[PDB]
Design a protein around this ligand. Structure first.
Ligand code: SF4
Ligand code: SF4
Ligand code: SF4
Lengths: 85, 85, 85
């Protein structure tokens, strides 16, 4: 739970901070994880997994974000109130 | 950056601890987000495709996990060393 | 070429105006097409095709459309020209 909780005062961690998780809390440690800097064989399948939907969902998110980066029209210094009141 | 950063000394935040993010930092806040306790229109979309490969990746992870939840055979109190030394 | 071409002076046609195509120009007409009001067998395939990229493509389109339904900010009757001139 290190990443979810941090190391000390929420300050540290491993992957959430740039450190590969080497499985140091598991019965299989360390032998079933070495070499540590190699990709887990199961990960290559999931990293070579194909998300054709990967670029779409990102493009849709950006659009939605852009409209959220636009204040409503009724916020101005014009002498006539547009807020609907 | 609140969830990534926490609120005070990494203690709190919003979604990371069960509070929906109401986009209080966005120029569109709050009108483009209300009503807050309703699902955002574009959410259900990305949900319905990952459901085809969720239970798969989930099982594939539960299995490797179990292998990692097993100590190497050479860890015992038998009369003879079997670690490879 | 009827729907692409219209029937008379580009006015009528068949499926383009709600008339099922019954293959009346084809060497197999009418036997390989009856019963007419039944769906084509091979058609049923691409019809029920589980293209779950669909609800995501219409959304990605509606979001683009909505932005194209907003005039740029510099269109207004304020005492200050703000087009970039
Ligand atoms: S390397 Fe260890 S301390 Fe770090 S996240 Fe993994 S199991 Fe936890
Ligand atoms: S509700 Fe606000 S403080 Fe919280 S994560 Fe969202 S933008 Fe940040
Ligand atoms: S029913 Fe006949 S005229 Fe109409 S589109 Fe089909 S081939 Fe053309």
């Amino acid at each position: 739970n290190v990443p979810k909780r941090g190391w000390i005062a929420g300050v540290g961690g491993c992957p959430n901070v740039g450190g590969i998780c080497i499985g140091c809390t598991m019965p299989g440690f360390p032998d079933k994880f070495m070499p540590f800097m190699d990709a887990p064989p199961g990960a290559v399948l999931s990293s070579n997994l194909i998300k054709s939907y990967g670029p779409l969902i990102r493009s849709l998110r950006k659009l939605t974000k852009d409209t959220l980066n636009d204040e409503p029209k009724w916020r101005h210094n014009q002498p006539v109130l547009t807020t609907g009141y």
